[model samples]
Target: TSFTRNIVGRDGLCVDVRNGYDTDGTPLQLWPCGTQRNQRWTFDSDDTIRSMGKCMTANGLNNGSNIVIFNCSTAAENAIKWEVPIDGSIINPSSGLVMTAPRAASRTILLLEDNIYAASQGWTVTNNVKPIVASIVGYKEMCLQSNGENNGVWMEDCEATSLQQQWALYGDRTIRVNSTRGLCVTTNGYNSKDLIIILKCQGLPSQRWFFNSDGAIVNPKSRLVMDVRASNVSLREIIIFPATGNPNQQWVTQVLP
Candidate 1:
């Protein structure tokens, strides 16, 4: 009754929805794990594989139709339910479709209503009692650390086991810290060069961080990047600056083993 299916694609990336959306009809595709909620799925009852409360559903009971999330019901033949049998293929009885993360130049996850001939249709399932942890890694090969003492965050030695160092990307586009959904990455103010800290989750734009194509972690509201304070490396306040190209603001998100 409790397990996780990584739902890996042919390229070894995981099949997941963008931004962990639990809404109806979100696009499912392959992505390198951000350790987001969408990438982690678990068996739901005998009929569904669910993540973030939405059941994986087929867009239609026809070939070439994409798979998406929708409501669940035992009484209907169109509720997007699935049956993962012994051969590792996920079958949707309503559509007679096989779940497949198509191997392509662009990986697209869909239900093969007409056939189930490839390895992409077969999923690797496993049982799990614990959740995978996602964390924020920064300069000097360190992790973003927080505490009550500073009421803020700073880069420190990457901790193998520290709640103060754990992070997960939320559906609202905020980076939640520790296991508490109420805690998130925040800033001391909206100023162009304010200090970055961990604060109570407020759903504010100041907390809405996005990684740029160039590796800058930015808060669009402040128009600033998460900076290391001129590369002080003295454990000064984690600050921000106008989005100028700089190495101090570039951060890499590393998945834990």
Candidate 2:
């Protein structure tokens, strides 16, 4: 849920300035990923692409044009405003220009006025944190999802957005939802209670579960590790039952860029 995005264009080259300068009028171009702030763009809530505290602007379109980083403005200037593509392409509404990252090794760019869409044009945000992923060992590509709200702990396909899928193993021995942090991995009926569920953070041992160096989540009070509910292991309901040190009882963590 708490994720940061690298503004990438086609070919996976990043949307960056000609140089890592904070100067206005610097041309925005596709370039190899760099550690400079110019390469980092935040698609802000206001629907403008931003970097180094400057807004990504499309100067004037004599037809096709290159994007640039400019001073932020409150005016309704079409060049300074942008529309977020739900399907993942970055577009300027007024000119109908789609930011295109040409599929090359590096440094090629384009403003597609053609309107044709491609996955190459699709760029999305991803995780950036003390990122930790807990995947059900036996579930192949599946990872833990928030099934606790209605059902129980179940495996869901790994998503790049981070969302609720990312979790943290706290020093207090509890799993915290990286998105809200107000939520904790909880057992429905804690202390010999119900199934594995997410509840408000309370710092209780029942709400506290540990990600072992041996690779399993175990509750201290009940001494039971979280696992699939025997009747249905179809990624529907996972509960804490026994400790077999088996695949279903084990978990692994993943790092995100």
Candidate 3:
């Protein structure tokens, strides 16, 4: 009774699954992994998270289900999509349901309903942040090197030169260095299926990145985000794919205190 489907995240992270259910008692939840059929989900421009023909509504009406993925309902239900508040969080304007990040956590994220002024519902937006990159020997087991040789190759086990690899974001949705190479997150497809090739910082459509209010970085071209998947092992691969608009792509950019 396993359903083979590709559960993709809004941030372009993907997961595979077999015979899965989106219920409270379900032991398997979103964890770091590669693209799986069961783990794949989708997010629409309206902000509705959909999977298995069901939208992520506050309550599973009709069936009186608590957390089951049911069939799509009427448009007026506003059940198809929810709005992400200005604070980088989602709020069900109709039901006052809120989705937020886990406590004292930098990566883990969650969703809660019918509560206002909850710390879990609040989020902080840190703009102009940059990631460190550098050139290394091989492409396997290495981070995406921004300015590596031969059109920016991924290097492995290389030194982390904050200056060489570090990149900053601009208001125009372009990622650039202080002066060197500009960084870009992949889009339009999944990384597991396609290789990310780096090109010049021409401010091209494919090179643009958006840090959405929902804690996701979006690429307009591919309509995906930069994500890391779990595979029951250490060292997950970073890729760009579709967006289910899940918390998996939601990242916390922090400044060392």
Candidate 4:
């Protein structure tokens, strides 16, 4: 019999559509298990797991191409079909890669595995789903917004319903935007005080970030924190500056219903 459920894995996060927005090229991510419709999937007898009227698709026959959901009619059946052997791990025969998630981090864009089928590839289909939506608030209580694709991000007044303000902190430590295109906060270069912008997720050190104990969103690549200067400006540019412990460098990630 066909079954519908939430596919839970690393960090116990559910396979989630980016910000619950499903479209062609919309990347699948591992996020905190949530009651939202975006977290639920149906395992069809045809060997496909589907959601939002789209089928889970393997983008390329490579290891790092993040899995995505595409229109059922567009993707070939082989590209959307999956196999769940007795091991409880899902493997994409088209790419010869197993579905994997970070074993501990709270969120991350799902990827095809290049290593041996290990704990990271194990998954559990369950009915448990909680509600979760997150906003990245920084410097002066402004929300971080994705200005555009392959472009810079800025701080603006919080808009509770804006997709640009919705973000996911991946288990791999990359902060990703919820827009149609799956992008991550990336650095321009390794130099200190380098400007920050959103780029396609590449699993690069420059894309990794963490929240310091003092509430700073720090990037280890440049040893800088995401900062906003000139409190007078309404739209403030986000940059990476030395950890001054200044309020401008502080950030808070709030989870909303």
Q: Write the per-residue lDDT of candidate 4 for residues 65-115, one digit (tens) a residue.
A: 778999988897777999875434688877678787744465578788773
Question: To one decimal, what is the Cα RMSD in angstroms of model 3 from the true structure?
Answer: 17.0
Candidate 3 C-alpha lDDT tens digits along 1-257 = 22233332212222212246654222222233344433445656656655555555544322122222434664346544566554334566665565432332222323444433332343322221223222222223333345442243233343455444444333334444434544343332334334344544433445556567666656655556655443111333445656656544454332211
Model 3 stretches with alpha carbons more than 4 Å out:
1-161, 182-192, 229-237, 245-248, 255-257
Higher-lDDT candidate among 1 and 4? 4
Candidate 2 per-residue lDDT, tens place, 1-257, comes to 11235665343356667767777777777676656777777766667778888888776653467667788874237887778654455778887876654443455544544344433344444323122434333345467776434345567678877466767543234466666665777776644325787777653445645456667667655767787666345737778766777776777777544
Question: By TM-score, highest first, what's the ranking?
Answer: 4, 1, 2, 3
What clash count does candidate 2 reach?
Answer: 4
For candidate 1, which ten residues in a row score worst on lDDT? 123-132
Residue 43 of model 3, lDDT score: 54
Q: Which of 1 and 3 is ahead in lDDT?
A: 1
Please give the lDDT score for candidate 3: 0.41
lDDT of each: 0.65, 0.61, 0.41, 0.73
Candidate 1's residue-wise lDDT over 56-173, tens digit each? Answer: 7777667777777665653244555778654445787776777665553344655555532343454545432132357677777777777753277887888788877877654334
- TM-score: the better of candidates 2 and 4: 4
Candidate number of the best lDDT: 4
* RMSD of each predicted structure: 14.0, 16.0, 17.0, 12.2
